[PDB]
């Protein structure tokens, strides 16, 4: 006769969803002076994080079911919006613009400011990008801001930063994160090299389109993951084993004017350019890009055919879909990126100040003018591809970019209490 | 046959060893704006999980015990496997899933058939 016995501390778990919390590096605590994501309201990371490799644990993973992506979706948007609550409405500035060309990507516009200094009116001028404003059809000399008839746009408070600090996300007590350490593992299915993680590595909240950058290189080969590689409704995520260097710049030493439009209220606008007008652009090593791209094809052809023609020029969607984009030095560049795919490298880039947190509903944020020149560089580490076997760059939203990193982990809940039959009866 | 071992891994998931072997590390497992909201909820959940296990161990009279035996016999209708088949040839992760549907049954039996009954019998004996 076997008897019921209770065992506590049983090493089992069930898959579960909970909230992960942030953990900061060291510096982020004191970056509150400007940085939105690198907040002071965040505990530190573990200076000596542990990891345990499990011997016989094999589990199913599915990156497209990874709920951590939703948490990152909401957190970035919420934090970004919170930081803009005290910022300046540009509503009264949309009233009028009399424009000529800058002495036409950039317009030199004069304007009439409505009662400002209590009982006074004033006139000013500023430089505007053609991507932020549009002409009046029956004038062709007068302009308005594009988003004015839908919603409010504010100018980010000058004391702001979006530096993409690699914040870590940690599980609460009672929970653990299991990591798939199988370098050849695709987006779904079983993984045998599994380890227990209490907290993940830091992930930079990088915002970009048509580019995976500044992290997560592949294990000495191009690694491609997709929900199917079959269905045209699905997309392909490409990891490179080597990064490709890109150097971007906006070589215009610009200044900015503070315009007061009433006592107690003001905003900044692009002022005069110190020096000549230089085109924003980015330098991509051609050989590295195309040598890598040849290697990408070597991996891609495994699913799509050995003589299959792949990788054509960007096409489809509006200019923010078609052009490649990033915040270089905080400045927003929209690059044609067709040279990279002009065969199945320096690109021109355009500048725009009205931006979305990936995509807003109605509202938008205005990027204050930046004094001086823009210089930055980065590591190209991957691609997202569009099915047509022609592939084109782009597609998806922030969750596809978050997923491209989060695919390594899943969350489980520890279930330590259970029973089993024994030969031992309770004594009384 | 040389006794080399008695080492520590950590975590010890119930796949790496059998239920019998796994029982040797119960102390291991035991040892193991919006931001405010998250800090709060995280702490609340940790408390809730902790207490739920303690509440069950409490009512069963198994508080403070890694292992406790009850007054309730095993019913083969829950599982008709032998002691060896369960303890030496299976790990907890696989085995528990087979009787998951009897959890509330057994938990209830080990409360009333054991402590309510045992304590009433003993209280009466102690009045003499």
């Amino acid at each position: 006769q076997l008897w019921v016995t209770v065992y506590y501390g049983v090493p089992v778990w069930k898959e579960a969803t909970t909230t992960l919390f942030c953990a900061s590096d060291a510096r982020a605590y004191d970056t509150e002076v400007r940085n939105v994501w690198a907040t002071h309201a965040c505990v530190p990371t573990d200076p000596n994080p542990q990891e345990v490799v499990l011997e016989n644990v094999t589990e199913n993973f599915n990156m497209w079911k990874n709920n951590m992506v939703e948490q990152m979706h909401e957190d970035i948007i919420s934090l970004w919006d919170q930081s803009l609550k005290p910022c300046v409405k540009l509503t009264p500035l949309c009233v009028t613009l009399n424009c000529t060309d800058l002495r036409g990507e950039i317009k030199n516009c004069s304007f009439n400011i409505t009662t400002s200094m209590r009982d006074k009116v004033q006139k000013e001028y500023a430089l505007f990008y053609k991507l932020d404003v549009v002409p009046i059809k029956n004038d062709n000399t007068s302009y308005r801001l594009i988003s004015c008839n839908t919603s409010v746009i504010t100018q980010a408070c000058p004391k702001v930063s979006f530096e993409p600090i690699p914040i870590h996300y940690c599980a609460p007590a009672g929970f653990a994160i299991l990591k798939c350490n199988d370098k050849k593992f695709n987006g779904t299915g079983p993984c045998t090299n599994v380890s227990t993680v209490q907290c993940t590595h830091g992930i930079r909240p990088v915002v970009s389109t048509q580019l995976l950058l500044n992290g997560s290189l592949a294990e000495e080969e191009v690694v491609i993951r997709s929900a199917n590689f079959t269905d045209n409704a699905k997309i392909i995520i490409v990891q490179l084993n080597k990064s490709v260097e890109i150097n971007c710049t906006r070589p215009n030493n610009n200044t900015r004017k503070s315009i007061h439009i009433g006592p107690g209220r003001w905003f900044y606008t692009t002022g005069e350019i110190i020096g000549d007008i230089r085109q924003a652009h980015c330098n991509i090593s051609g050989t590295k890009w195309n040598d890598t791209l040849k290697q990408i094809v070597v991996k891609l052809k495994e699913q799509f055919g050995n003589k299959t023609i792949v990788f054509n020029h960007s096409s489809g969607g509006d200019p923010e879909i078609v052009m490649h984009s990033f915040n270089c030095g905080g400045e927003f560049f929209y690059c044609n990126s067709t040279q990279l795919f002009n065969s199945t490298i320096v690109l021109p880039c355009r500048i725009k100040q009205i931006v979305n947190m990936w995509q807003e509903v109605g509202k938008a944020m205005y990027a204050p003018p930046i004094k001086g020149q823009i210089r930055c560089s980065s590591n190209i580490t991957g691609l997202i591809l569009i099915r047509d076997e022609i592939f084109r760059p782009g597609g998806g939203d922030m969750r596809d970019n978050w997923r491209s990193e989060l695919y390594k982990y899943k969350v489980v809940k520890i279930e330590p209490l259970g029973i089993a039959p024994t030969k031992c009866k309770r004594r009384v | 046959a040389v006794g080399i071992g008695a080492v520590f891994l950590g975590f010890l998931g119930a796949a790496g060893s059998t239920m019998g072997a796994a029982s040797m590390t119960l102390t291991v497992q035991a040892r193991q704006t919006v931001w405010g909201i998250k800090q709060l909820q995280a702490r609340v959940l940790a408390v809730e999980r902790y207490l739920k296990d303690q509440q069950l161990l409490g009512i069963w009279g198994c508080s403070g015990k890694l292992i406790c035996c009850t007054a309730v016999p095993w019913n083969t209708s829950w599982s008709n496997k032998s002691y060896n088949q369960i303890w030496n040839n299976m790990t907890w992760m696989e085995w528990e899933r087979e009787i998951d549907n009897y959890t509330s049954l057994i938990y209830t039996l080990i409360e009333d058939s054991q402590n309510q009954q045992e304590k009433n019998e003993q209280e009466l004996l102690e009045l003499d």
Partner: antibody
């Protein structure tokens, strides 16, 4: 799970040598380590083993008071400490891991690359 | 542990059958580990508890025997197997290995 040993050494008789072995890819304290030596022209000589968790050791009778093992878990590294070196101590010093199923030696499938010591 | 091994010059051709014998005066019951080693390399395990084939070790390797007398058989010898072979005895310690035998070219 791999074992990584330090470099080679040249010593004169009467000297001592210390050979490290790092626990890459696995928990240092979760699997006991053996030390085995192979002098030129020789088969495999067991020197002893160390428990990375507790510090417990066993050594061959041949080396009592001569071969010692130590460990420092903060760097996941075990060490072989050999004194009174003589010409018979020329050889390859290897670190290795067993399965220790049931905490008893089974056989060793994970080996370091071995380092040489010349004496 | 008081182990006697087959003559070291165990010549064989590829696809041939070569065996290594490990017979000790002391019993280990089954606590014997079979190893394969190349010059310049650490020895590695083939068979444990005198009969369990380690995953990753080719199916051509098998072993028989008990108590004191164990034999390692390579049923279809390949070029990569022209290695030395050892037994390690675990009844007690020191857990030394035998002198080792070698498979030679026929």
């Amino acid at each position: 799970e791999v074992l990584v040993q330090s470099g080679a050494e040249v010593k004169k008789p009467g000297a001592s040598v210390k050979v490290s072995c790092r626990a890459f890819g696995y928990t240092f304290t979760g699997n006991a380590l053996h030390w085995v030596r192979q002098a030129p022209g020789q088969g495999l000589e067991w020197l002893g083993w160390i428990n990375p968790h507790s510090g417990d050791t066993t050594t061959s009778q041949k080396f009592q008071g001569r071969v010692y093992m130590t460990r420092d878990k903060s760097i996941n590294t075990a060490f072989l400490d050999v004194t009174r070196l003589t010409s018979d101590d020329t050889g390859i010093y290897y670190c290795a891991r067993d399965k220790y199923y049931g905490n008893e030696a089974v056989g060793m499938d994970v080996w370091g690359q071995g380092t040489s010591v010349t004496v | 542990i008081q182990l006697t091994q087959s003559p070291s010059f165990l010549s064989a051709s590829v696809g041939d059958k070569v065996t290594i014998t490990c017979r000790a005066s002391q019993g280990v019951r089954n606590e014997l580990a079979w190893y394969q080693q190349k010059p310049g390399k650490a020895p590695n395990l083939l068979i444990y508890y005198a009969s369990t084939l380690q995953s990753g070790v080719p199916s051509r390797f098998s072993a028989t025997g008990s108590g004191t007398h164990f034999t390692l058989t390579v049923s279809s010898l390949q070029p990569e197997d022209f290695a030395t072979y050892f037994c390690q005895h675990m009844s007690s310690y020191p857990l030394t290995f035998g002198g080792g035998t070698k498979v030679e070219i026929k």
